[PDB]
Amino acid sequence: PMPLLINLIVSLLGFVATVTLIPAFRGHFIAARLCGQDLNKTSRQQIPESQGVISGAVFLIILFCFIPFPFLNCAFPHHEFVALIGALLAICCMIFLGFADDVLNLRWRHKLLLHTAASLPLLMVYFTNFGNTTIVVHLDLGILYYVYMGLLAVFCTNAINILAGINGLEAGQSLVISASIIVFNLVELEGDCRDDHVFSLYFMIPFFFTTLGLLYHNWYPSRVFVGDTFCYFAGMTFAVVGILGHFSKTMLLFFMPQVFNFLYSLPQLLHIIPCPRHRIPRLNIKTGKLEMSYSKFKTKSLSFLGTFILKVAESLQLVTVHQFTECNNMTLINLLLKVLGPIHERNLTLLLLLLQILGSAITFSIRY
Amino acid sequence: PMPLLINLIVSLLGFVATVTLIPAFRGHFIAARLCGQDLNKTSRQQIPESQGVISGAVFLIILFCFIPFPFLNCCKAFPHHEFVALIGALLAICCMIFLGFADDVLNLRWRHKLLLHTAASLPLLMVYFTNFGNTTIVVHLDLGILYYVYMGLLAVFCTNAINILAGINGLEAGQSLVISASIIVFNLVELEGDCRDDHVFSLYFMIPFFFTTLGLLYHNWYPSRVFVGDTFCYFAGMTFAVVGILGHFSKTMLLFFMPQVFNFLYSLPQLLHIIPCPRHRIPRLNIKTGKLEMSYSKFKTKSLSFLGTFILKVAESLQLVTVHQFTECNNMTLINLLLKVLGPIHERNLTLLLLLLQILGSAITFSIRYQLVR
Numbered sequence A: 001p002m003p004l005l006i007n008l009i010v011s012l013l014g015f016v017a018t019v020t021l022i023p024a025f026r027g028h029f030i031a032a033r034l035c036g037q038d039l040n041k042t043s044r045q046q047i048p049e050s051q052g053v054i055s056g057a058v059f060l061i062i063l064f065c066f067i068p069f070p071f072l073n074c075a076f077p078h079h080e081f082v083a084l085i086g087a088l089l090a091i092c093c094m095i096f097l098g099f100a101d102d103v104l105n106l107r108w109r110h111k112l113l114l115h116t117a118a119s120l121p122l123l124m125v126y127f128t129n130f131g132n133t134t135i136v137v138h139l140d141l142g143i144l145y146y147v148y149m150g151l152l153a154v155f156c157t158n159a160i161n162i163l164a165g166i167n168g169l170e171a172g173q174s175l176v177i178s179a180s181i182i183v184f185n186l187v188e189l190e191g192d193c194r195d196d197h198v199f200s201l202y203f204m205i206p207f208f209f210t211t212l213g214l215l216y217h218n219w220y221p222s223r224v225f226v227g228d229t230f231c232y233f234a235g236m237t238f239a240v241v242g243i244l245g246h247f248s249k250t251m252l253l254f255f256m257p258q259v260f261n262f263l264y265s266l267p268q269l270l271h272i273i274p275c276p277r278h279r280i281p282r283l284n285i286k287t288g289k290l291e292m293s294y295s296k297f298k299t300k301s302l303s304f305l306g307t308f309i310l311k312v313a314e315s316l317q318l319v320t321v322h323q324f325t326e327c328n329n330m331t332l333i334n335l336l337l338k339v340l341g342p343i344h345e346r347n348l349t350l351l352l353l354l355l356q357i358l359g360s361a362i363t364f365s366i367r368y
Numbered sequence B: 001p002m003p004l005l006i007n008l009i010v011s012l013l014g015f016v017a018t019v020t021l022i023p024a025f026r027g028h029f030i031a032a033r034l035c036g037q038d039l040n041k042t043s044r045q046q047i048p049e050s051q052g053v054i055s056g057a058v059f060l061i062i063l064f065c066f067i068p069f070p071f072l073n074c075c076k077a078f079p080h081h082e083f084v085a086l087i088g089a090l091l092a093i094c095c096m097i098f099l100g101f102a103d104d105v106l107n108l109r110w111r112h113k114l115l116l117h118t119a120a121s122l123p124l125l126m127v128y129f130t131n132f133g134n135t136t137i138v139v140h141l142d143l144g145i146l147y148y149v150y151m152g153l154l155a156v157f158c159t160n161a162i163n164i165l166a167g168i169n170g171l172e173a174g175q176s177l178v179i180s181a182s183i184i185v186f187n188l189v190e191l192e193g194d195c196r197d198d199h200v201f202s203l204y205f206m207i208p209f210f211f212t213t214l215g216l217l218y219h220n221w222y223p224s225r226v227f228v229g230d231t232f233c234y235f236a237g238m239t240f241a242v243v244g245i246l247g248h249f250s251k252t253m254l255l256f257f258m259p260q261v262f263n264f265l266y267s268l269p270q271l272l273h274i275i276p277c278p279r280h281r282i283p284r285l286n287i288k289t290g291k292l293e294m295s296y297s298k299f300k301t302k303s304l305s306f307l308g309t310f311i312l313k314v315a316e317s318l319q320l321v322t323v324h325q326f327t328e329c330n331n332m333t334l335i336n337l338l339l340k341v342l343g344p345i346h347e348r349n350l351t352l353l354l355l356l357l358q359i360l361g362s363a364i365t366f367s368i369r370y371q372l373v374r
Ligand SMILES: CC(=O)N[C@H]1[C@@H](O[C@@H]2O[C@H](C[C@@H](O)[C@H]3O[C@@H](n4ccc(=O)[nH]c4=O)[C@H](O)[C@@H]3O)[C@H](O)[C@H](O)[C@H]2NC(=O)/C=C/CCCCCCCCC(C)C)O[C@H](CO)[C@@H](O)[C@@H]1O
Pocket: A036, A037, A038, A039, A040, A049, A108, A151, A152, A154, A155, A158, A159, A161, A162, A163, A164, A165, A166, A167, A168, A222, A225, A227, A228, A265, A269, A275, A276, A277, A278, A279, A280
């Protein structure tokens, strides 16, 4: 089709724009103190933080210019245009919130409230355009359905965020997921539901190419860091395409390593097991590779429920406790390291991307 | 009406939210090093910058929560066009808040800022086309694509028109509040007239803006405890451009922009770099007096091109610019011009004077609109 072709053109041009603009603005970011040190590397220099903003900005630009082409000589259909503009509002709000958060370092409560408020537009569009709240069981979920979507949105913004820390991972898994969703959209295009999946494509192709431009700089050695800007941006874009596309189940299935990491980290997130500020592997100076990390805490003080959960985990061979208590920091990165010992940062990132691809293949096998 | 009542309620709640949250987040801003030095006082301390974002944030929140209330049981056919007007306008405003915040953090160049103003203005034009589409000026000529240009530039004007008229305390938020209040009165008067949907839309976007900006002014007033920054400048300008464009009273609105239009044109020679343009063209405080005096731009005459010398000679002829002899030319901004007309004025008094002049401009606009005695 012409719309998809134009979309691809502007998407490639936007990729070029991102790759070009990142270094042009480096001085700006550095002067603004928007930078962070590579915690998993020996050098202690600063590295541009919240680079996603540039990519994010470009992304918006692209869509802002691409809105008209689907409607060339098309009683105008205000509802599809409403879907587009509302989705763009949600995404823009989320990019803006991520950039703000990185500069300001907001507490978790602030984060969650702003996530919900910025997620409302998705519910607006969904209600006005589609507004179906029934799941096969056939039970009509009602208001709770909206809640679900809401939560889903939040999840997508924060899940990708917590599965981070090693060089190049964030944008990498984001790209794998985006590509899988693109393939799924193209397959289902010939099927019964075609408009939903071409919408998902409209939003996915430019995201894919811009995120690629960002990963170009973010790959090991990381010359830049993407930050909450990008994390929340990608999360919300995925939530949008999945919700308005009516394949949130397939998407969540694409979110397998993310879901597993989130649930695995759930005791720390809820303060059951003490949650350090940074829960990433520790580079061993001698090895030249990433070992696991631990949470050290006074044993007796811990709540009873926490001790019980930790004992269950030790029974299941998930946590390598060294009883003070030194529990193994529970993130997917550290779990891969525990199963396969010390791994180089680049190699570990690559392994994680490959596992994501395997999850996508499993999902495709389930659907088909 | 129920929607306007709910709007007023949530607007007052948002005013409280702003006045409360502004000081609460000061630690975040300071720690992030987002602050500026108060150039018009002897103190050297830092003041949190871009606090407008907070207001902006609250603003968005309010409208995100207010979108449903206009449509209550609004028949199986929902009107997507009023809804898209709302949503597109909010996309533009949010994009603009975001642009101002990122610009204050990054200190972007003029080219970058203007380009992004255009790109963030596109949603407004999309809404206008899909919903209204009229491109005829009653002067009766079809402007065609140029109308879309006009609105575009108009948007890009507003965002910047408030930004350049700044520097003293409370001028940005103050003039923005005067404008918003006058536009609210205009919307209410015209509410009972022929065009009710356009003006109730203007109200929807104006009332919460007025009250959140009031929350910001509470702290921004002299002595300034906060700075609003490009975030608030762009946010306000773009909200105004939205209500005016989609409200179909851009002429009346521009008439409300009399101080800002005059200050923009009067600054035009320096903006175009014909006459050398300093990075800050604010009135220089006098340490002895304690009042604000004019500021000049010093430069070698030889470098100055023929056109610049001509403009300067014309200005001197009209008694608009003071020139001494290298050569120094009075900085051209409405603040410096009022100081030329009235000599030294204290900071607070000068701010209040500019607000009063803004009120007079609004009154003139009402007289012209309704053919009333001045
Ligand atoms: C707690 C946690 O996981 N923290 C992570 C999380 O922390 C966030 O970090 C961010 C910064 C981090 O990226 C730093 O790592 C450095 N870095 C990054 C790459 C790199 O290659 N090298 C490098 O040095 C680099 O300096 C960079 O500043 C940020 O501060 C967040 O505020 C911080 N916490 C959260 O988001 C909490 C977000 C709260 C999430 C709430 C979840 C709610 C979901 C509910 C859904 C449900 C209701 C449906 O991500 C970090 C990634 O490194 C982890 O180290 C850290 O352990």
